[PDB]
Assembly symmetry: D2
Homo-oligomer: 379 residues x 4
């Protein structure tokens, strides 16, 4: 389809006579039609109309029957109704039934058709919709910061009723951000999750999802009325959890390591700091399996979908390409952050390698699968 215009059916390439308006200027007829002046029109359509007439006349005799002429006009985009068929057979003068191209072409060019009437619109849909009222997540701070009263609460504002409910950011904020109708490539896999930030980039004060309290707010880590802070240094990336997940203790991971009874941890390596309790969509890129006291303490490595570089980061191997030093720094921070308190370096499975996204994603599901049961056992 780069030489000459065709029929759109099945034919040979050899015997079709190339528009005489093309051979003359030695330019294919495709180039002539698309990029030439409009003089390769009515006279140009003629030959493309003659070759298509030859394409329905397979028993190449020199004419079609009033039955073929019919679909061909359906083929060429024309809305042939009964009131226009008889008109056709009436106009077309062939008392024997046979119609020659010359006769057909002349008739065609003399009846663009009746565009009037009522221009029809097919309403055929598959009507697939949902009642679900999109909810707006809201986060309100209350209490005084760096004291046992400060909390971060979560709410849904019905974007239809405008009514508000308090939710658990752990149970009610979707782990998977899905789209009713996904328009991104079929070929490109789904990688969009919600991330709840607990410890903001560049800070060292401890906060956590209160798994004990109702609606699981975000509270600060406070022992005997004094707030707690990481002493090794500040968290240099947003650090929080992926909601709707649970590292169950009743379970064994990568050898003989039990979960830590916590929602899975995530580290957001983007350049933008989140506020305590802030939720945002992330892209999972890998996972670091650390052991926290014989417990399997993973760390999902994700990047905010809103980061300048998220698009160039496909898997865990590109992080060193665009964010050199990041992983080794992330590794090292976690490996040694307890030593300043008089503990010892933490250990890792997989020889501390940052396992890729597919590995990370499976881990996330299992974590999600366990949260699901915890929902039913406790209900």
């Amino acid at each position: 389809a780069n030489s000459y215009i065709g029929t759109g059916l099945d034919t040979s390439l050899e015997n079709v006579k190339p528009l005489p308006e093309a051979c003359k200027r030695n330019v294919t007829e495709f180039d002539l039609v698309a990029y030439g002046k409009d003089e390769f029109t009515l006279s140009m359509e003629k030959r493309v109309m003659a070759r298509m007439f030859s394409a329905f006349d397979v028993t190449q005799l020199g004419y079609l029957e009033e039955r073929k002429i019919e679909h061909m006009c359906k083929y060429l985009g024309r809305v042939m109704n009964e009131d226009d068929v008889k008109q056709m057979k009436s106009e077309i003068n062939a008392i024997d039934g046979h119609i020659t191209f010359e006769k057909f072409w002349a008739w065609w060019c003399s009846h663009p058709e009746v565009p009037a009437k009522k221009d029809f619109f097919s309403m055929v849909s598959v009507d697939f919709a949902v009642p679900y009222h999109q909810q707006q997540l809201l986060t309100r701070e209350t209490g005084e910061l760096y004291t046992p009263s400060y909390r971060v609460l979560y709410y849904f504002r019905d974007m239809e009723t405008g009514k508000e409910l308090q939710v658990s950011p752990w149970h009610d904020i979707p782990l998977y951000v899905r789209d009713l109708v996904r328009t991104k490539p079929a070929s490109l896999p789904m990688n969009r999750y919600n991330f709840i930030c607990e410890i903001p980039k560049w800070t060292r004060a401890k906060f956590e999802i209160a798994t004990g309290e109702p609606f699981n707010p975000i509270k600060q880590d406070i022992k005997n009325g004094v707030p707690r802070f990481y002493k090794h240094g500040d968290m240099m990336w947003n650090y929080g959890a992926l909601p709707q997940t649970w590292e169950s203790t009743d379970v064994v991971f990568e050898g003989g390591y039990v979960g830590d009874n916590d929602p899975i941890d995530a580290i957001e390596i983007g350049m933008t700091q989140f506020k305590v309790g802030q939720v945002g969509a992330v892209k999972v890129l890998g996972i670091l399996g650390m052991i926290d006291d014989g417990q399997m303490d993973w760390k999902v490595i994700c990047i905010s979908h809103n980061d300048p570089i998220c698009r160039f980061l496909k898997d865990i191997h590109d992080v060193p390409k665009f964010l050199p030093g990041c992983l080794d720094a992330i590794h090292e921070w976690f490996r040694v952050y307890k030593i300043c308190q008089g503990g010892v370096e933490n250990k890792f499975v997989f020889n501390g390698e940052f396992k890729d996204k597919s590995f990370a994603m499976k881990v996330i599901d299992e974590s999600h699968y366990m949260w699901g049961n915890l929902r039913k056992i406790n209900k």
Copy 2:
């Protein structure tokens, strides 16, 4: 911040600042957070004493076992009955009144449970909204540059895996909405779906076949020959917003009737879409062109995936990042017919590109119109 607080209501004055701070001339806050040391049992105590005084508003010198209770809950303690009775028993305050020293001494002797914390609040707002996320698909069929070429649309159930054919126009949603929206409440909603009919840098005409079933995208062929913009190539992705209809039974700015088509949008981003390709866009503005005496709106939107989409908030940021773009879109639409013996096209609002709010509103009425067109014909 100066000194550890109780989180309640008091006077700044007489609070005696930890002696380990004054000594060092550092605030208590600085000390606690940035000092490499662990607040000694003796330093917690003073902080704990001051907490007890904040619960003792009537400054009596003790609390009633009911307050010691709230206070213990304040400080994070899981106080059940077997715990409450336990405390009341250890303290042995026959009159009900508990003094700090007695409290402290009890507390320092009972760091409580470790595993009984197995308790996990399950209270949720059980918003069970299951459904089957569908995956849009598109298959080419027929031969290109011929009356047979079509572009079909389907939904793949991302659960059952079953596939059904749909209409790009009636079935692909106009508003890309999230079951739970996590983007800030302050940031208004701006994510619509766009159906590319004619690709950036191309001039071959295509279109959502409103008359055919399922409305595939077919090519513009008249008398067996495909049609092409002769003026030049579209320089941006040109398509439509699904689920919208500019009705003819209606009049828009200037007493101009609609053109019986889904509304047109132009996508200014750098990446070229492929014929029939769908994607999420941000609506920026709108240009009112008069096509054959009818109202032919043109939404100006950018793909949410463009390196600059984020830096474009309304129609006035286009010339800051894409200078020459708006001018060029207008001029191309103002003269693309003259090369075929036609005249300059006219526009409403003196050819200025109205802002996104105005744009969105028009898209809405266009969506409402579509919706009605469904009722009438069903």
Copy 3:
């Protein structure tokens, strides 16, 4: 634009608009540029006639062979002597006066030379500024976390290929300048070189050895043990601006003396530099911290290679794109000593980050100071 113009001075009124335009109800401009046709010999003529009338200010009805000359040059013609005499001869206007018709007729008969256009104006401003672009290099030597580890700097002649060792501090330029600046005159110059001493996410101390020859970068080792920020890790690239010196023989805002070091800059971009790594930055602001009673400025700059550098114009755009950043830089500098039994550091201008202009000025005086320090010691 309405109708083809002469590029000179006339009245809009009586100009008779090409008949081929009026016919079509399209401007002449629209027609000429967007009409697919070639302006017929007959259409050029009217345009050419109107040009001749614009040279005929005294509206006489002819021009003198000296004007026909300029006019021919206006219209792009290369009119030399063998050409001038040729024209005067063809026209044969014995009295010197040439009428349009005669002119046109001559013109249409002499499209002139084709290859004689071999003439190429070579007139330049011969600004022959040859030199040897050097390529900075850096070689590690010695063992890391020991008194031997150094980082040396060299220039590779990008012509002769010869390599000489240099001082990162005296030889790497402070201002990255272009022999010929092509960035708009309106956009002021903001490109300085930065020498990373301590990498983003690291806490091991390094420093440009001002006392040693060539000033390599050496590690901070006291009594055989390397030194480390105990407070936390630097969270941004921390280094210095070469060719600057905060002199002690000077007093800055608040009667604070300099600290006898090259000025410090912090690089807020996402990418971590490697120890001793140099790069171009954009200066955004400046933070006056008092270090040991001396003035310890800290330039806030971003690598010119950061995805957001372009969207950061002054110190107030930092919180829009890197929210929490300025706050955090200040707090880290305000307390990094307390963890070692020290006190909060103080700042000038009430700890606000002054803007780039203020910053640049300080860097200048710092550059001037350095320059003087070269004279005194040489």
Copy 4:
């Protein structure tokens, strides 16, 4: 160097006794020093000071000579002068000359040295600078647009003297944008050129560098007083030339194709439109060899250094990755833009493949080499 602190010289790994403060907490001494509290200090330095004393005492006897003690203190960063050497030998009580570590350490810890005096600063440079006055390029429009008077002129404003001169954008604007001292990787090759835009993105009006006129301004293409415009459509990318280049006719390229007597053409595929005559730095990515009337008419494919994606575009193969459709569109535009006027498709060498950057760059040099001679032959 991840276990324990070393001497920085040459020794064995086995016999060195690991700090007793380390074995106790089972944390390497490297982790102890860097991430532990400061109690692993004076007592910690002691052993690292004892092992380094053992490193200078190669004939392991139990002491050094007043000559070794000397360089070691030079090694440990101390500025040992004569007035501090005698002090040393005077303090250190060893009338025999031999000095035991215990004696050395005790002396050390009792004399941090004389930081007073005059803190010295090495001024040793290689002083390599240039007199050249950075010039500011300026472009002034004059004349009336779409008439034979409009021109775009170029000027240099001395950024020292503030004096201004008129220049040729063809001869005087550097082809190579070089940096006096290049700080970008040695490993990463130089790819920075100046590009002069003649035809702005999204327009169809013709403009060109007047190779005939003095100072070679930018003028519009005007034949018989009417301006000329591409009739095939608008230029959809900024189209112009690379200054300081010349496709010589006295030369043959890729077979039997002669240059076109023009400064080499470049196509800027960035998302931002340049103004007529606007100059800017670009990154060369490839080259398309088109034949314009038997002449070798190249087209350099470059991207503005200021484009959001320039950094992710390394060579010609990534253009389809990030800017899909671009090259085929660029190819096609050029292949057929003359047909609307009644000409025929243009041909290409290399089977129309877009040759990579290294190929493109060599072509650019040759082009630059030819411009250079044209400078001398004509001078």
